[PDB]
Design an enzyme around this catalytic site. Structure first.
Site, PDB file in Angstrom:
ATOM      1  N   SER B  81      -9.189   8.332 -30.488  1.00 16.56           N
ATOM      2  CA  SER B  81      -8.076   8.750 -31.338  1.00 16.56           C
ATOM      3  C   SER B  81      -8.083  10.205 -31.785  1.00 16.56           C
ATOM      4  O   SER B  81      -9.102  10.718 -32.240  1.00 16.56           O
ATOM      5  CB  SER B  81      -7.998   7.860 -32.580  1.00 16.56           C
TER       6      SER B  81
HETATM    7  C1  LIG Z   1      -2.187  13.843 -28.412  1.00 15.75           C
HETATM    8  C2  LIG Z   1      -1.142  12.804 -28.824  1.00 15.75           C
HETATM    9  N1  LIG Z   1       0.129  12.937 -28.416  1.00 15.75           N
HETATM   10  C3  LIG Z   1       1.059  12.056 -28.744  1.00 15.75           C
HETATM   11  C4  LIG Z   1       0.771  10.961 -29.556  1.00 15.75           C
HETATM   12  C5  LIG Z   1       1.845  10.231 -30.055  1.00 15.75           C
HETATM   13  O1  LIG Z   1       1.667   9.284 -31.016  1.00 15.75           O
HETATM   14  P1  LIG Z   1       3.079   8.670 -31.489  1.00 15.75           P
HETATM   15  O2  LIG Z   1       3.890   8.279 -30.318  1.00 15.75           O
HETATM   16  O3  LIG Z   1       2.617   7.304 -32.198  1.00 15.75           O
HETATM   17  O4  LIG Z   1       3.679   9.590 -32.481  1.00 15.75           O
HETATM   18  C6  LIG Z   1      -0.540  10.776 -29.993  1.00 15.75           C
HETATM   19  C7  LIG Z   1      -0.940   9.581 -30.587  1.00 15.75           C
HETATM   20  N2  LIG Z   1      -2.174   9.414 -31.035  1.00 15.75           N
HETATM   21  C8  LIG Z   1      -2.643   8.302 -31.597  1.00 15.75           C
HETATM   22  C9  LIG Z   1      -4.168   8.226 -31.677  1.00 15.75           C
HETATM   23  O5  LIG Z   1      -4.711   7.103 -31.603  1.00 15.75           O
HETATM   24  O6  LIG Z   1      -4.784   9.290 -31.898  1.00 15.75           O
HETATM   25  C10 LIG Z   1      -1.804   7.029 -31.737  1.00 15.75           C
HETATM   26  C11 LIG Z   1      -1.966   7.916 -32.914  1.00 15.75           C
HETATM   27  C12 LIG Z   1      -1.500  11.713 -29.614  1.00 15.75           C
HETATM   28  O7  LIG Z   1      -2.785  11.588 -30.039  1.00 15.75           O
END
Ligand SMILES: Cc1ncc(COP(=O)(O)O)c(CNC2(C(=O)O)CC2)c1O
Ligand SMILES: Cc1ncc(COP(=O)(O)O)c(CNC2(C(=O)O)CC2)c1O
Lengths: 325, 325
Positions: B81
């Site tokens: 994450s």
């Molecule tokens: C680099 C990057 N780009 C796009 C996204 C988009 O998340 P969303 O679609 O939920 O806004 C994450 C997600 N990250 C998550 C994680 O687990 O870190 C779901 C939050 C991201 O890390």
């Protein structure tokens, strides 16, 4: 961009690798502790690759290169060498080839891991840490020149008078935005171009700001003498005088690439208290040598720390860093 | 900042974590290839941690946790994450304690490394399934809170109505820093909190900029129901009405986290042709879809692609990548 500096750089053909002026932020906590207001300039958001101090330099080197009809740049550095990658990846964007003459423990992590991903060419040679692969670069540039292929060799960290103009421009940019009048400006010192350009510029703006370089490795005679030479040729390039060399405190912990519980704690500190990451080979030792001085009352009241990227180190040597916290 | 979105965001308690507007650059080499103009908004240079779309949400979230007096902030996420790391660190920077309820391999790399390095507490529930790692998050809070400690739980990816105002404000900024009119703006969709607010801001702004998210994971069910319900519970908050839905395309290549050979290639290309680095689980996938659709003209002549960060995963998985090139 300051009127004068612009006027003095305008002659040099540079490639524009950056869109915005990177921010200068104030750091509340490290200021309360240390006791001085320390501002940080995000040069690590210069944008290209992993970003950092080199990008600004590549602008006058590769700007030049794409002039002398070169079609295959060569460079050197550690195997984890940011510059090497960034010079490589940059070489490729401008439509050129690139050969990296690295030196060290072949580890598939950090920048060497990146080097491959991006497919940049890699050549390692176990040789005198004196960065004397700078000779392997030449033999390499000779034989390639003996093929009609026109190469372009780059000096450790773009420690070239023309790459130096890199920060000479960065000082003018630090002058158009800065709302704070700094007493001193810190920044790690690897090859010396960041201190040079930064210094050539200050002197050019004739600012009463102190150029403080935080050596991160060798020093003996070479690092300080050669430093002066470098900033001389640079000025002779811009055709202007020098306003007495900068400062240069060694905080390398003995040898380049050494990762100590001090370079380590100061990482988690800046990270967990300001929300900014620094590395265990360059930026981490210089912020650490920022506190030391700001507590010994040796930096003044207003200090600006030029973050120089290097984000790959923290991943490369993330294992040691742990075994130390 | 567009005046309408400024007024609509007026009363919502934010924590300023972003000192500037992230730069928008034209990608000429990739544009001359898909037959369309592609512009990248650099939100990967937001500032906190490894940057990313999350820092924006964290301004409102952490300004929701604070306005409520919390001492421990909780959030979930895959071991890799970007959200989970950046959330704690940020929480730590605001002097708030942070516990991350991750799920997955205890490998020491990517954001797991950064986590431990920056000393964020971590609970890796081998519960490798989905986001029902949130029931574990909430129970840790029950225990935690029957002891004065006031925890604050942030949804997966911080996709809560007010964390969504992060990109609402983002279109607001975009809408201004840009002297271009896009046909669509694309952003990776994982937990969908970003695509959620983006639609909001383009709904309130009202031009004909299409919200185009390319799903990075198995374009689920709750996903499509969750996505809508996020978008509107927030429309109610600003008191604005929801124009009409956002476009969502599946490019998970099978499932969340699958690194196929096309992903590696899209990283090499963008890396060595535009000098920009994307990761293998989020942005690399999103831009891969952006191409594939622009080729078939399916995305307009002027596309805006928001780089949401993720640089960590590129170190975290640069081996799988290497075995794909
Ligand atoms: C680099 C990057 N780009 C796009 C996204 C988009 O998340 P969303 O679609 O939920 O806004 C994450 C997600 N990250 C998550 C994680 O687990 O870190 C779901 C939050 C991201 O890390
Ligand atoms: C993160 C970071 N900060 C400061 C420096 C300073 O180099 P200079 O002293 O030559 O300006 C480097 C160097 N890097 C080198 C490398 O080999 O990577 C010597 C170029 C750096 O990477």
């Amino acid at each position: 961009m300051h009127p004068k500096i612009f006027a003095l750089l305008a002659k040099f053909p540079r490639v524009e690798l950056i869109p915005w002026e990177t921010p200068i932020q104030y750091l509340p906590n490290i200021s309360r502790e240390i006791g001085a207001d320390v501002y940080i300039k995000r040069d690590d958001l210069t944008g290209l690759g992993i970003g950092g101090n080199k990008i600004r330099k590549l602008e006058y080197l590769l700007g030049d290169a794409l002039s002398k009809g070169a079609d295959v740049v060569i460079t050197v550095g550690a195997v984890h060498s940011n510059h090497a990658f960034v010079t490589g990846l940059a070489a490729k964007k401008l439509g050129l080839d690139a050969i990296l003459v690295l030196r060290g423990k072949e580890e598939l992590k950090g920048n060497y891991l990146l080097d491959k991903i991006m497919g940049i060419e890699t050549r390692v040679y176990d040789a005198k840490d004196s960065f004397e692969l700078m000779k392997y670069a030449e033999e390499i540039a000779e034989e390639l020149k003996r093929e009609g292929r026109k190469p372009y060799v780059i000096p450790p960290g773009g420690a070239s008078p023309i790459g130096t103009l890199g920060y000479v421009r960065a000082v003018g940019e630090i002058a158009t935005q800065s709302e704070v009048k700094f007493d001193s400006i810190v920044v790690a010192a690897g090859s010396g171009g960041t201190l040079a350009g930064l210094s050539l510029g200050l002197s050019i703006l004739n600012e009463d700001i102190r150029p403080v370089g935080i050596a991160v490795g060798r020093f003996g005679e070479v690092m300080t003498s050669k430093l002066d030479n470098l900033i001389k040729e640079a000025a002779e390039l811009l055709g202007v005088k020098v306003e007495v060399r900068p400062e240069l405190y060694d905080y390398s912990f003995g040898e380049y690439g050494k990762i100590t519980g001090e370079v380590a704690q100061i990482i988690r500190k800046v990270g967990t208290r300001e929300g900014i990451i620094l590395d265990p080979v360059y930026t981490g030792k210089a912020f650490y040598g920022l506190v030391d001085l700001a507590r010994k009352g040796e930096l003044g009241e207003k200090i600006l720390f030029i973050h120089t990227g290097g984000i790959s180190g923290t991943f490369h040597y993330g294992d040691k860093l742990l075994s130390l916290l």
